[PDB]
Each structure stands twice: as structure tokens, then as C-alpha cells.
Amino acid sequence: ATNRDQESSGFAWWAGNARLINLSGKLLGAHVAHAGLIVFWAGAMTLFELAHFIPEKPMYEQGLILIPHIATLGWGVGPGGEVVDTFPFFVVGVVHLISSAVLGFGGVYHAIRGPETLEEYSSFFGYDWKDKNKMTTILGFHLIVLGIGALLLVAKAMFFGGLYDTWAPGGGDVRVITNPTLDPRVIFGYLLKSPFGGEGWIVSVNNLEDVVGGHIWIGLICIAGGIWHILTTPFGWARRAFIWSGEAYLSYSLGALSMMGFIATCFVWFNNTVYPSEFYGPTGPEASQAQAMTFLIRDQKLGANVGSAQGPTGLGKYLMRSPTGEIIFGGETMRFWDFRGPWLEPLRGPNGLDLNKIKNDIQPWQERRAAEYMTHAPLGSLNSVGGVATEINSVNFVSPRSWLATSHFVLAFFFLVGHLWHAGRARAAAAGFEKGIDRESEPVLSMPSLD
Amino acid sequence: GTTGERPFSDIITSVRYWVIHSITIPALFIAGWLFVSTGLAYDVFGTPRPDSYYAQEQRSIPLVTDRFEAKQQVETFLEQLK
Amino acid sequence: AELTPEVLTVPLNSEGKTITLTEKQYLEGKRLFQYACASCHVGGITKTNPSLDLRTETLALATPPRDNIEGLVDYMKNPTTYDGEQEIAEVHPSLRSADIFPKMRNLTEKDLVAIAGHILVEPKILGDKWGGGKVYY
Amino acid sequence: ANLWERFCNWVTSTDNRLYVGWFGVIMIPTLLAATICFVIAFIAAPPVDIDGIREPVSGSLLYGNNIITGAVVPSSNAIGLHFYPIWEAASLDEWLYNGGPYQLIIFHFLLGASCYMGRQWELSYRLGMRPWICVAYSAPLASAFAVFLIYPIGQGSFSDGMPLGISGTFNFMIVFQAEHNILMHPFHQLGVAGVFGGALFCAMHGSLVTSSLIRETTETESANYGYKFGQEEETYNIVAAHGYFGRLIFQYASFNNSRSLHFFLAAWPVVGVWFTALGISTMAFNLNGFNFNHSVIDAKGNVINTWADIINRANLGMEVMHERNAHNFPLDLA
Amino acid sequence: SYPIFTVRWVAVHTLAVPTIFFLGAIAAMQFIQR
Amino acid sequence: RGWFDILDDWLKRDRFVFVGWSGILLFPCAYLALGGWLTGTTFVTSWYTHGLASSYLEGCNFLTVAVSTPANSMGHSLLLLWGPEAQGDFTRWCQLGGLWTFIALHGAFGLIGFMLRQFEIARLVGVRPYNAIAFSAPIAVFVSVFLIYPLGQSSWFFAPSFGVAAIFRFLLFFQGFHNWTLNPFHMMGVAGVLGGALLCAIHGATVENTLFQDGEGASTFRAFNPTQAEETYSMVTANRFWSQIFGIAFSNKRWLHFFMLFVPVTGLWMSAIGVVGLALNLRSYDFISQEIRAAEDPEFETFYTKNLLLNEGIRAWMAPQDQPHENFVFPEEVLPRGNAL
Ligand code: CLA
Ligand code: CLA
Ligand code: CLA
Ligand code: CLA
Ligand code: HEC
Ligand SMILES: CC1=C(/C=C/C(C)=C/C=C/C(C)=C/C=C/C=C(C)/C=C/C=C(C)/C=C/C2=C(C)CCCC2(C)C)C(C)(C)CCC1
Ligand SMILES: CC1=C(/C=C/C(C)=C/C=C/C(C)=C/C=C/C=C(C)/C=C/C=C(C)/C=C/C2=C(C)CCCC2(C)C)C(C)(C)CCC1
Ligand SMILES: [Cl-]
Ligand SMILES: [Cl-]
Ligand SMILES: [Fe+2]
């Protein structure tokens, strides 16, 4: 048997894909066919969502995570996030799903029918894991494809309809970006921001200009690096530093994807710019701030002076200062004062919330949004009962920010475990004790006693 | 080793097995289905049907409050549903 | 106990006339109540203003009276404050503000009546629980 | 050999009584800072306004605590997720009032414990061992990350991180049940199976190997003297142990491969603790346990309580009393 | 030369035949409307 | 060769499922405990004893079904089918909670039978009975929790009910009423259970990662022969690793495996003792010095005082529904509550 059994390949069935490590043709088929399943899911799930979609309910009351990604890109939506035309969602769905069939055709062909290994069919597509030059060149190719991809997002924003801008004046609208940010002081200042509260590292990006700009930088950086790695081979210090094997390379990618999954988790939980609350529901901080606003408005309508109302602890019942003096909402939501959102910023002055604006300039749409966001806070049960844990059945709701953050923390953590597993194993295999200690030269036995 | 019984792989793959169990398994299932569908499970165990938890205008539960008059209490509760 | 036409008979107007609902309408009104109202009115309280609940005793003391189908249907078209003095379609969903509350667009007169019937039938079933809040969970 | 190479050989030396290693270079200063700050604060730190409401909680021994009630109190809710190093405070007195030691301790600790994990991989590479011990440690480390870091991140405040104290831990657990129904979450139920089963199988394996010790000693001396450190042969009879245990249940529910047996011992509690850590980490984003409150109703519509509704009444008691001065508005949204 | 009826036979059937009977009862319960 | 000796040979016959003398106690009792739980979670209510639904028949799922304890008014009655409470009536027996005593009592004697089964098999194979000895801890837990605890209380009503969320209720009751987290006997129980899981995980992983190479495959499992005389992993390398990582290590294989018996076994025994104390309400609920200070000094607050306020909320908010035979009527205005919530 061409591997395909434990005797000849040295791997059991439960580690059977390890048999493909040195069969480049059969390995190609697995990768392409699996890529087919990814494109398939993106396809079928969009159609599923569209089939279940009711345009009169908010997207986030309907369990949708893919249609919000298409709407953010400016397709299918008008002012306020309102769905104008669902046809683009159908196109996105059908086109991915059809593509998965040519991917699936190619993967099943390469895995079953085609050559087991590629190295005798063409020195271009074949490779040895240990070939440092060939390995960096494939890396270089894929770097170039990634940077092109980043530039496609730019072309949509600047030349092909714009992006949905939750900050656009008048309640949000699709909008063409004509002045991307290119100042590297801003683009890279994000990378040097602290990840802690009030700074938020790159999760704090709050305007589409910076977003489009950053993707011009990344797209050109990837294209440069792709070329760099196609024309270069690794330097001495890099060769002594890494393990050069199929398994080590996998373990470096597992590390990378873990880090990225943690960042994604925090992006969807905190960022309301590239995850517009119009589509994903309010953020945790946002909902909690919206509750303080709601009851500020109600009590003020009754004749309360919200600025001078002393709460039970002595802090203001409605308004207090943050630790650096800014006027902020009171109560437990004091933890969330870093929140920024289109519905709240018009009440903000140089020293924080402005009592004059609070007393006079609160519009009904702000009261509407605050009530809506407060009653769509991202709390709810695994069986999709909305609210705190003590609420009764009635509301069938779990925020998509909850679904997206929890699922990706779980994915990010298991890939960190995978990184440790395959990184440790690649080190041991390359030194030659991954199968156990050699009885005839147990290293400990040649070392002095500790005591 | 072997304690002398017929191996399990041998039986579930044999034809005589599934000939006998193509009937017994679904028959037991259907028998179980009929135990509930006929309403017989309610009367064996004394479990309320969805209409016999409360009387029409009572919000108190028929809690048994006496050790030796207990079976007599439940009978009194059961006749105030009618 | 069970769902009887006696339980399902609620005031139609303020003039003591009544109307009897079916099972289908009651479950329809509950389905539609969850769809459009429960985010704020779960169990008969009001999350964004707990001072006002959906108890029949409360609806009776609203101006105009709201403890009958017609008064409840009218509130869902042109809602007012509790004393009747201000209209609040700008901040409370209604047919009059179906533009800014899009969930109200696909509601027909038949639907609003089913919703009101639910609101009026439910406290006869749950008693204190309806509009009582967590004390009675 | 130059100085740098000499230094590298000492750092990675396998002859040090305690292995240092490159992970050890980070681990040693960070664990020492955390340990020394924790000891001093547990004995001496003044009261801390954990909930940001000017209502300080006394945690230290000198301020009227004992071992069971003492804690290093989490930092003020007014701070939220902001970074609060000593140099950001106007004075040590302000840093203490607002809960500064808690941030100092947990950041150094999580860093050191991550390097502890790394240090376990490192020494195993220098000794020629297989590398996956550090993977098993990832389960307790992941759990520590969940209570001190991830759960504060989801909720927006290190003031809802787990206190560094015995009673402070129970407070965390109760408040958590009210707000997430963690008992009704299958990932916690999986953690319970993880540690119950872990303890079960720990006792099983201990009792079965001990049941089959080969007679090597008289009745006066300890049986432990039948094993000599590093002896080549085994000291128990796995065939006899299999023979007992195969008959106790049935023959195939029992292991006869030592390797398969020991991998089962590692895999069971580690996987379960992975899940319970993943449960704290996903409830950090308020995906809570099953809500069956009022899930059964009768033909009229009356609520027929189940045991789930009884759990909810207890949850409601924790909810309404916890942090009894910290809420101005009716929903406790984080 | 295997028997068909053994103590083993009795053991597996004491469990299995009520199990399937109970599964059919529970399946039927899914269709009870209040 | 009497008839006794002939019966002995058939019981101790080597078959797929060993029977033995102990089986006569074990198999009937375990099967009826098991069967009684399955019967009661599937078909039987708790409406008349508790005011609760508890079966799939009523609409409960796997997490909310239970065989619930009998009503408080039954006291500690054995609740025999032929007893004076049910008087032969099977349907009434089910409604009055007889399945709880049925399951509790048959399960008690099934546990006895299982331990004798360990002694019986141990003697016939010729190994020492340390596995029987370890099983004493589960027995101690079962007896203290299901039998001794309610016997010290007013009735079987307050023992655990057999169900997933019924046990969760028991947990929270023990927090709110007994302050059981503060009890050092439970703390020792926690340390033994968490420590047993630790020892299980660390021993398994140490063996798996100090194996000798005894085959050429990447699956190391096939390189173990149960008749081989040699250790399958290196104790000397395991020892050095832990010595340099953690400071100390095991050096004795027998002590290592005795320690793994000892730790969880002693933990469960210690927690059993505290429950016996709770049978009498002999709690470690308070620290008196803290209450004296707190009562006099309204600025003194610790995590201990904070937890008692939580306990007080549990008691008042759950008692009316949890003990319905008490007819607790707590008006809103007396329910303890913080601000706003
Ligand atoms: C998928 C992306 C990817 C990957 C996997 C690689 C992988 C590799 N690159 Mg390449 N590279 C890329 C994209 C990528 N590159 C792009 C887009 C560019 C263009 C900017 C380059 C430019 C580049 C150069 C110029 C060189 C490499 C080299 C290397 C090799 C050494 C790796 C190394 O030391 O890591 C990094 C590990 C280290 C220990 C180095 C220190 C890194 C510190 C600790 C991290 C912090 C600094 C960080 C780079 C920037 C700060 C980020 C902060 C603001 C958050 C390795 C094969 C080297 C090589 O061998 O060339 C042939 C080399 O000299 N790469
Ligand atoms: C999506 C995940 C995935 C993918 C892409 C692969 C891919 C592959 N596996 Mg792995 N594997 C996986 C999951 C996966 N596996 C899992 C989960 C397990 C554990 C159970 C294994 C266990 C395993 C073992 C033990 C072995 C492989 C082997 C192989 C390779 C040859 C398979 C072979 O001989 O097929 C032969 C099978 C058939 C001819 C039956 C039909 C197969 C086709 C593909 C059915 C597809 C139908 C589908 C509907 C497509 C039709 C649509 C059309 C338009 C194309 C191949 C590259 C083998 C290998 O390495 O060989 C060197 C091998 O020995 N795998
Ligand atoms: C990354 C994926 C990948 C890779 C590296 C390969 C590589 C290879 N395949 Mg495979 N194949 C793939 C995908 C892939 N294929 C897919 C998807 C299909 C189904 C359509 C096939 C079907 C297939 C068959 C049936 C055969 C091969 C053969 C070959 C070999 C020669 C191909 C050649 O000369 O083309 C040279 C290149 C061209 C002719 C240019 C066309 C490539 C497209 C049109 C460029 C478009 C790129 C696109 C813009 C990028 C975006 C796509 C997506 C991300 C949206 C080589 C080993 C042959 C072989 O091994 O002989 C026995 C063979 O007979 N392949
Ligand atoms: C190992 C077998 C076993 C054991 C230990 C038990 C034990 C028990 N059962 Mg269970 N039971 C069993 C099998 C068993 N059962 C079987 C197989 C069934 C199916 C029919 C049942 C069905 C069942 C029901 C339906 C009920 C019980 C109940 C009980 C309890 C009361 C028992 C009682 O008072 O007996 C009294 C009888 C004896 C003590 C037997 C006396 C022995 C003889 C007569 C003594 C005289 C000997 C003589 C003087 C000298 C002989 C010497 C020799 C040389 C001849 C107890 C927990 C009750 C219960 O759980 O209540 C809640 C109950 O209602 N059982
Ligand atoms: C949050 C945006 C709400 C939604 C969704 C619904 N209601 Fe509402 N309701 C809400 C508030 C804040 C108030 C108080 C208004 C005021 O200032 O007076 C109300 C009030 C009512 C009433 C009056 C009850 C009374 O005691 O007089 C009724 C009858 C009512 N609301 C009905 C209702 C219906 C039928 C809804 C679904 C279509 C609905 N509400 C949704 C807040 C919110
Ligand atoms: C190798 C292998 C494997 C794997 C495989 C794979 C992974 C595959 C894939 C494959 C694929 C990936 C496939 C795909 C396909 C696709 C399709 C077939 C599609 C179709 C489509 C259509 C037909 C559509 C239609 C439509 C339209 C157009 C419109 C709307 C409606 C509808 C939707 C109907 C396994 C593991 C099994 C085993 C071993 C071996
Ligand atoms: C798009 C966008 C943007 C931008 C971005 C950017 C511009 C980025 C960058 C990025 C970057 C720039 C990154 C970097 C990274 C790095 C890393 C990740 C590193 C790593 C390292 C490592 C891994 C190493 C390791 C080691 C050591 C340390 C020693 C020796 C050994 C080894 C080598 C292993 C923004 C935000 C503005 C906005 C939004 C959008
Ligand atoms: Cl608290
Ligand atoms: Cl608040
Ligand atoms: Fe062992």
C-alpha cells in the first residue's frame, strides 16, 4: 500500500493524515478539497441566511453573521443600515457555492487519481520541505496573493461603491473613501498603542479613512515581502534559529492563527466601526452606556436635575467623573466610559459629557437608539433566551457579537494547543527522540547527579 | 482468553441475528410508543396530564401534608379537578 | 385547568361589551407579542420604564382607558403618555411610526387585535406574575 | 569561549539543581515580584475600593482578616481595564486605595506561569524527552488565564476578576452563578466530569498498582522498600491487575497496555479542564448556561415549576444582594 | 460450539429490551401538545 | 461435595460477567436502583410532594428530570410499598415519593454488594484488596449525603433528589443555608479531589513523555508487551526532570501509586465528616470576631461579610418555593435587596 496503512507509514489511522507528509500530490488534493469546504460553507450559509432573512427585523435579531459582513462592504444597504436590495447577498452566496464545486473537483482529482508526489512531474510544483529556497518562494507567491487581496478591499472603498460608514453624518450611510490615511505616524501609531483600556491597540480604529489606509500599507508591504522572499534565501542567523521541517512550518502557522483568533475575538467584542452596531447589535460597553442614557432621559423628562443628583454612595446617580476628570455616566457603567459611538458623541464636549447638551440637545433618534441598544445587550443563554441568567423565556435572542467572540476564543485556544503540540514534536523529531528515549544511551545516565 | 461465549462481532453480523431482531427491536419500540400514546402511562404512575395539574381557578398546589392520611389527600385533590 | 372561552373573553370596548377569542388568536397574539413587544415588555413589565406595566389594573387607569381591545388597538396606532396628554409615536413603536420602527410595517389590524387579546388574557392566566417582575419569577 | 557563550551554557545547563533556561530568565524575576508583592499585601495592604464606589473592602491580616477571609482585593471599577502601574499613581497611598497590587501581582504571575509552561518544554528538549508535559499544564494555566484576564476583558473591568483570597474565591463563584448560570453550562459540567473522573481514575490506578505489588519485603518493613530507584524490572504484575479488573467489570473494559492506560490518565482530566476553562472564557462574553425558566406550562398556561425554576430562585437571591450599593439602574448588564 | 443462551445473554437483554421500550415511549412524548 | 460446594463452583465459574456470591446481593439491587431512576425520570411527577414537574412525560429534559425526595410530612418513613402510607397502591406509592426510598435503599445495598465483589474477586485472583479499600470513600460519601444528612434533619425531603439540576439546587441550598464553602472539611475534600485530578494528569503525562523507544513506529502504543519484564518508561529521567523543574520528584514507584490512592480517598472521607456535622446544623457559618467588629463598625467590610449577604438573599428568595410545606408568605417589602436590582 502506498502508505495508507500503519505498517508501511508508521502512523496509525487516528494520525492517518500524517502519512501525507512527503506525498506532495496527495497533500495538494487535501488542501484544495478542504479549501472547497470553506468556500462551500460561505456559499450555503449565505443562502441559508438569505432564505431566513426578514428585512423588517434588525439583522442581529435573526442570527446572521455572514450577511452583516456583506452589508459592511456597502452592498445591499442604504442610509441607516436599512436593507434596500437583497440581490447582492444572493450573488455572493451562489458564486462561492459554485466555486466550491471546481475546488472540490480539483481536490478529489489530486487526492485519488493524480500523482501521489509532484517532484517527478515538474520541478516547479514539487518541493522538499527542507529546500529553504523553494519554501521561501512559495511563501513569496502567497504573500503577493494576500497583498492583492488587501488592495481589493481598497478598490471597493475608493472606486467600486464605498463602504458602510456608521459614523457618516445623518445616522450612517454607504460612502466612498477618497482620502485614505497614508501618514505612517497614524497607520503605525496604532501598532504602538497599549492594548489596555482607553487605548485598545489596533481595536480602537474608529474611522474608515484609517481602515482603507492601513490596507494600502499592508497590501504594498505584502507585495514587497513576496518579492523579497522569491529572490532571497534565508540568512545564516535565520537558518540556525528555526527547525526546517513540514511539521515545524505547520506549528508556526498554528501559532499565527491562534494570535489572530484572539485579536478577532476582541475586534468583534469592542469595535463598532468595522462591526457596525446597526448589523451586529450593540457592544457590551455600548449597551451598558445606553441604559444609563435611557434612564437619564426618563428622569430628566420628569424634572430631575441629573447633574446634581447625588447617588446612594455619594457619587452622582447619573453623571460622575472618570479618574482623569472627564464627565461620564454613573453607576456600574463607569467602567465603560471609554466607549465611543455615533449616537452618543454629539453630547460630548471638551470635558466629557456636556450638561447643556444633555439638558437641551437630545434628539428622539438618540432616545430610540439608546432604548434599542439597552434591550439588545449581548447577554443570553446557550438555548438563545435573551437577557440575564435570571430572565424568563420569551425573547429568542443571542447577540452575534457573543456568537462570534465565543466561537473564535474557543478556536484560538485550541490552535495555541496545536502550536505547542506540533512545535514540541517538530523539535523532538528533528533531534530524533520523538519516539522515545534510547535505552542504550539514555542521556540522563551520562550526566552528573544533582546531589 | 475466551470464556467460551460466541464473539459479539460474530453475532451482530450474522444473518440469523438480524432476522430475529428486525422484529423484536421495532416491536418493543412500537410497544413503548403505545404505552404513552394510549394514555396508559398517566394512569399507571399517576402523572398529571396537562389539564389536571390545577383546578380551573386554583393557584395552590395539591401538596400532601399528612403521613398516614396521604393516599386519602391525593384522592380528594383528584376529585376536585372534575 | 385549560384554555376556555371563559378565560378567552375580554372587554372589547369601554362600554362593557366583550368579545371571545379563539385558541388560534391567543397563540397568534403571543407569537406577535414576542416578535414586536417582548424586548421591552417581557412578562408585562417595561424594561425601559419599570414604573409602567401591562397589568389590567394599570391599563384601566390610563387616560383613555386601555383595558379593552379597542383602547389597546388605538394605543398601538397612536400611543400616548399615561395621562393622555402627549403623543409618543416618536419613541414608542406604533403604526403611526412604522417608518422608524420597521417591525410595525407588516402588522395588519387583525394582528394588533391578537396582540391586545394576549395582553388582556395573560394576567387571567398568570395572575400576579404578569407585570410583577422578578419577585414572582 | 567568550563570555556570551559561557553565559548561554550556564543558562541552558542541565547540571543546575534547578533548571534556568531562557524561559527561566523571564519566569524568575516575574514570579519573584508577584510573590513578594502578594505576601506583603496579604499581611499589610490597606482597604481597597474594588467596586469603585468609595466603599473599601478590607483584605489584609493587619486590618482584621484571618487566613480564610483575607485577600488581595481586585482593582477599582473606576479603573476598568486601564493599566495602573505604580508610576501612574500620584502616591503609593492612592495606588493602594485603588487596588494597584492586584494588577501588579496578576500580570507578573500570568507572565511567569506562561514561562513555567515554556520552561517545561525546554528542559524536556535538553534531556531528550518527549515534549508534551507542557501541554497538560496548559489546562490549569488556561484556567488561571480565564479568571484573572479573559473574564475581566469580556466584562470590562479587572474589578470582576477573581480575588486573591479564599473567601474572595467563593464570592466570585456565587456572583458567577447568578449572572451566568454556570451550573447549567455543559462546559462546566464537563469540568466536573473532568475532576471527578480524574480523582476516580487516580484512585483506581493507585489502588490497582498497589493491589498487585510483587512480594519483595517481610511483614515488618514497608512494602515501598520493594522498589529500588532505577531498577530495570517492574514491581507490580499488570497481568494480575488486568485479571482482577477484567473480572470486576468485563475483560475488555480493562486496559492491558500500559502506554494506552497512562495516556488515558493524562487525557481525561486535561480535556475536561480545557472545557471548564473554555466555559469561563466564553461566559466572559455572556453566552450563558441553559435557561429553562418557565419552560413547562400547563394546558391553561400556568407555569409548572421544575428544578430549573428552583435554581433560578436561588440565582435571583444572589443577583439582588451582590454589590448592594453599586447599581443605579434596573439591569446589571456587566 | 457456542451456546445461544448464557448468563451473558440474560445480562444484555435485561438492559436492552427495556431500553428500546423506553426510547419508543420517549419518542412519542415529543408529539404531546399541551 | 455438598450442594453448597456445587453452588459455589457455578457462582465462581469464569464467564463474561462474573457472578460470585456477592452477585446475589449486587445484580438485583443495582439493576433496581438503575431501573427505578430510569422509570421515575421517564414517567413520574413530583407534583404532590414538591409542586414540580420532573419527568420526560411532563415535558422535562435530561437536565431537569428527577426522582424527587418525598414530602416533608412523611418524615423518615421507609415508604414501603406495603407500608401504611401507600398500603399496596403502586400509583400512590409513586405519587408519595416511594421511588426515592426504593432507589436510595436498593442503591445502598448495591454499593455493599459491589465492595464485596471487589473482595471476592481479589481473593480468587490472589491480589491484595486495595481497590476494595479505596471504594470505601464513595460509600462514605453516599451514606453521609443521602442517608445520614436527612436523618439529622426533619425528613427525607431535604436529602438530595436524584437529578442533574436537583443536585445543583442542593449545592446552592448548602451555600445559602449551611455556608458549606467556609467548612474546612469541605475544603479538605476539595483539595483531595482537585489534587487527585492533578496526580492523574501529571502521572499520565510523565509516563507518556519518558517512554523508551521500544518500536520504530510513530504510534508508541504498539511498543508495549504486557509480558515484558522491563519498565516501559524511564523513572530516572522522569525523576531528574521534576527535580529540576519543581524542586522535588518521586523516586519510589510504589510510594507514587500508594499516594494516588491516598489523596482522593482521604479527600472524600474528610468531606463526608463535614456533612455528618451538617446533619445536625453544626455548621462553620460564622467567624464570631468578625461579626462583633462588623456589628460595631459600619465601615468594616471583608469578603466574608459580603458572602453572608449573598447567603441571606438565597434563603429569602428561594425558601417559599423550595419548602412549600412551610407556607412561607414573604411580602415584597421584606425581601432583602440591594439598590436598583
Ligand atoms: C506570512 C508572513 C511572513 C513570514 C512567515 C515570513 C518569514 C520569514 N521572513 Mg519575511 N517578510 C514578510 C512576510 C513574512 N516573512 C514581509 C511582508 C516582508 C516585507 C516587510 C518581509 C521581510 C523580511 C526580511 C527583510 C527578512 C525576512 C526574513 C524572514 C525569515 C526569518 C523569520 C524571522 O526571523 O522572524 C522574526 C523573528 C525574529 C526573532 C526577528 C525579530 C522580530 C521581533 C522579535 C518582533 C518585533 C519586530 C517586528 C518585526 C516589527 C514590530 C511589530 C510591532 C509594531 C507590533 C522567515 C523565513 C529574514 C530572512 O531570512 O530573509 C531571507 C529577513 O532578513 N522577511
Ligand atoms: C476534510 C478532511 C480530510 C481530507 C481532505 C483528507 C484527505 C486525504 N486523506 Mg485523511 N483523514 C481525515 C480527513 C481528511 N483526509 C480524518 C478526519 C481522518 C480520521 C478518520 C483521516 C484519516 C486518514 C487515513 C488513515 C488516511 C488518510 C489518507 C488521505 C489521502 C488519501 C485518501 C484516500 O486514499 O482516499 C481513498 C478513499 C476513497 C477512494 C473513497 C472515496 C473518497 C472520495 C474522496 C469521496 C469524496 C466524495 C465527495 C462527495 C466528492 C464528490 C463530489 C465531486 C464533484 C468531486 C487524502 C489526501 C490516506 C493517506 O495518507 O494515503 C497516503 C490514509 O491512509 N486519511
Ligand atoms: C493551489 C491549487 C493548485 C495547485 C498548486 C495545482 C497544481 C497542479 N495541478 Mg491542479 N487543480 C486545481 C488546483 C491546483 N492545482 C483545481 C482547482 C483544479 C480543478 C479545476 C485542478 C485540476 C487539475 C487537473 C485535472 C490536473 C491538474 C494538474 C496539476 C499540475 C499542473 C497544472 C498546470 O500545468 O497548470 C499550469 C497553469 C495554468 C494552465 C494556468 C491556469 C490557472 C488559473 C486559470 C489561473 C487563475 C488564478 C486565479 C486568478 C487565482 C484566484 C482563484 C481563487 C483564489 C479565487 C500541478 C501539479 C495536472 C497534472 O498533474 O497532470 C497529471 C492535471 O492533469 N490539476
Ligand atoms: C438482593 C435482593 C434484594 C434486597 C436486599 C432488597 C432489599 C429491599 N427491597 Mg427489594 N426487590 C428485590 C430484591 C431485593 N430487595 C427484587 C428481586 C424485587 C423484584 C420483585 C424487589 C422489589 C421490591 C419492592 C417493590 C420493594 C422492595 C423493597 C425493599 C426494601 C425492604 C425489604 C424488606 O422489608 O424485606 C422484608 C423481607 C425480608 C427481610 C426477608 C426475610 C428473610 C426470611 C423470611 C427470614 C426468616 C428466615 C428463617 C427464620 C431462618 C432461615 C434459616 C435457613 C437455614 C432456612 C429493601 C431495601 C421495598 C422498598 O424499597 O421500600 C421503599 C419495596 O417497596 N423491593
Ligand atoms: C421599547 C422600545 C418598547 C417596545 C419595543 C414596546 N414598548 Fe410599550 N412601552 C414602552 C415604554 C418606555 C412605555 C411607557 C410610555 C410612557 O412614557 O408613558 C410603554 C408603554 C406601553 C403601554 C401603556 C401601558 C400603561 O400602563 O398604560 C402599552 C399598552 C404598551 N406600551 C404596549 C406595547 C406593545 C403592544 C408593544 C408591541 C407592539 C410595545 N409596547 C413595545 C416601551 C416599549
Ligand atoms: C479526499 C477525502 C476526503 C475529502 C473530500 C473533500 C473535502 C471533498 C470536497 C468536495 C467539495 C468541496 C464538493 C463541492 C461540491 C459542490 C456542489 C456539488 C455544488 C453545486 C451547486 C449547485 C448545483 C447549486 C444550485 C443552486 C443554484 C445555482 C441557485 C440556488 C439554488 C441552488 C442552491 C440549488 C474525505 C475526508 C471525505 C475522505 C478521505 C478522502
Ligand atoms: C490593515 C489595518 C491597519 C494596519 C495594520 C498594520 C500596518 C499591521 C502591521 C503588522 C505587523 C508589522 C506585524 C508584525 C508582527 C510581528 C510578529 C508577529 C513577530 C513575531 C516574532 C516571533 C515569532 C519570534 C520568535 C522567536 C524569538 C523571539 C527568538 C528566536 C526564536 C524565534 C524566532 C521563534 C490598521 C491597524 C492601521 C487599521 C485597520 C486596518
Ligand atoms: Cl458581592
Ligand atoms: Cl448601574
Ligand atoms: Fe502508573
Numbering used by the authors:
A (entry chain c): 23 to 473
B (entry chain e): 3 to 84
C (entry chain v): 1 to 137
D (entry chain a): 11 to 344
E (entry chain f): 12 to 45
F (entry chain d): 12 to 352
Per the authors:
In natural photosynthesis, the light-driven splitting of water into electrons, protons and molecular oxygen forms the first step of the solar-to-chemical energy conversion process. The reaction takes place in photosystem II, where the Mn4CaO5 cluster first stores four oxidizing equivalents, the S0 to S4 intermediate states in the Kok cycle, sequentially generated by photochemical charge separations in the reaction center and then catalyzes the O–O bond formation chemistry. Here, we report room temperature snapshots by serial femtosecond X-ray crystallography to provide structural insights into the final reaction step of Kok’s photosynthetic water oxidation cycle, the S3→[S4]→S0 transition where O2 is formed and Kok’s water oxidation clock is reset. Our data reveal a complex sequence of events, which occur over micro- to milliseconds, comprising changes at the Mn4CaO5 cluster, its ligands and water pathways as well as controlled proton release through the hydrogen-bonding network of the Cl1 channel.
Specifically, a slight elongation of the O5 density toward W2 and a slight elongation of the W4 density toward W3 are observed at 250 μs. This latter trend continues, and at 500 μs, an overlap of the W3 and W4 densities is seen, with an mFobs − DFcalc peak (Fobs and Fcalc are the experimental and model structure factors respectively, while m and D are weighting factors) at 2.5σ between W3 and W4. At the same time point, the W1 density becomes extended toward D1-D61 and W19, indicating a higher mobility of W1. At 500 μs, the W1 omit map density also becomes elongated toward the region of D1-D61 and W19. This coincides with a decrease of the D1-D61 carboxylate oxygen density that is within hydrogen bond distance of W40 and a shortening of the distance between W40 and D1-E65 by 0.5 Å due to rotation (25°) of the side chain. Consequently, a continuous hydrogen bond network is formed that connects the OEC to the D1-E65/D2-E312 region. We speculate that the changes are related to the first proton transfer from the OEC toward the Cl1 channel. These changes are reversed by the 730-μs time point. We observed the start of the rotation of D1-E65, which is proposed to be part of the proton gate, and the formation of the hydrogen bond pathway from the OEC to this region at 250 μs. Along with these changes, the electron densities at W1 and D61 become more prominent at 500 μs, potentially related to a proton release from the OEC to the proton gate residues D1-E65 and D2-E312 (Fig. 5(ii)).
